[PDB]
């Protein structure tokens, strides 16, 4: 067979993307959006429909402008994240405005708004992950959603900080980053080019899927963001890898069965006692591509979140 069957084998597949075409192509278990993604599907004309339900929607909910804009932005994410579980038999991840990263209560109240949302939509809460950036105050609120009936899924995971973080808080699913970890690696150091099993986003995932086997933690290992198949390869194992179309699309084009590299035969052992969070910042800070990574990609999410209001801004 093709790469992309033999993967489902050992690895449950999740398409990367609000696009619902790679959906119908490659029958995802999941699919998984972030604000740039979300972003580049208000550009697809299909969606069109999609942004006009959801100001005329905002529209009806209030009259003040400001509340409107948030309403349409939020009912969007939402839109799309309906049409795509039309799709799919599994969940859809959607992320909360990056802006309240480092606000614990901001991303609790966020967090519970989009559930009301999708909710009002019908969907209930065991075909969401609400998506949070893995800092100290996004792996807290996550913590108190868990705990109120909200998966979460927490993303932009760069350090084995925030890695045992994130399992200590007993959050439904992690997407510790691939690609991105490459990509700092090539630009901030000597080695440009890295065989699959050298490869720092590699090496990264396939140490926190151990750890996380190892003490028994139910955490969900989703590797995310991928440059090449071979990272893709290299992890096959691992519980659910989310995968953008272009990658997909090569898996289901290359043939040859490939073989499961990630697993862990040993006996569950005995968990530490939970990290602090002055523990946490200490070795989170000793990482400088996850001090990096981690600042940027919340950065970059924010602005793409800003983008989107200017345009929804514009047809209010």
Not at 43 to 56: G, M, S, T
Not at 76 to 89: C, D, R, T
Not at 182 to 200: G, M, Q
Not at 245 to 264: C, H, Q, T, V
Request: hydrophobic share 40%; charged share 25%; aromatic share 8%.
């Amino acid at each position: 067979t093709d790469k992309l069957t033999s993967l489902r084998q050992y690895t449950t597949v999740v398409a990367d993307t609000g696009d619902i075409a790679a959906m119908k192509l490659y029958q995802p278990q999941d699919a998984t959006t972030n604000p740039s993604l979300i972003l580049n599907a208000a550009q697809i004309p299909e969606y069109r429909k999609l942004i006009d339900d959801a100001v005329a929607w905002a529209k009806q909910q209030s009259n003040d402008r400001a509340q409107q804009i948030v309403d349409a932005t939020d009912k969007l994410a939402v839109n799309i994240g309906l049409e795509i579980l039309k799709l799919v038999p599994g969940r859809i991840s959607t992320e909360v405005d990056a802006r309240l990263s480092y606000d614990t209560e901001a991303s609790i109240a966020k967090a519970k708004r989009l559930i009301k949302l999708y909710n009002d939509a019908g969907i209930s809460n065991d075909r969401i992950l609400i998506k949070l950036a893995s800092t100290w105050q996004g792996i807290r609120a996550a913590e108190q959603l868990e705990k109120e009936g909200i998966n979460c899924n927490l993303t932009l995971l760069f350090s084995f900080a925030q890695a045992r973080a994130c399992a200590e808080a007993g959050v439904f699913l992690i997407s510790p980053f691939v690609g991105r970890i490459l990509d700092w690696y090539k630009a901030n150091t000597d080695k440009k080019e890295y065989a699959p099993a050298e490869d720092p986003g590699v090496v990264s995932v396939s140490e926190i899927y151990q750890y996380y086997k190892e003490h028994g933690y139910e955490t969900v290992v989703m590797g995310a963001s991928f440059r090449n198949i071979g990272e893709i390869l290299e992890l096959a194992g691992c519980d659910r890898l989310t995968i953008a179309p272009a990658l997909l699309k090569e898996l289901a084009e290359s043939e040859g069965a490939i073989e499961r590299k990630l697993s862990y035969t040993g006996e569950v052992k005995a968990r530490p006692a939970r990290i602090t969070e002055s523990e946490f910042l200490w070795q989170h800070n000793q990482d400088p591509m996850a001090v990096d990574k981690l600042a940027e990609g919340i950065r970059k999410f924010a602005i793409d979140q800003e983008k989107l209001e200017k345009m929804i801004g514009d047809l209010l």
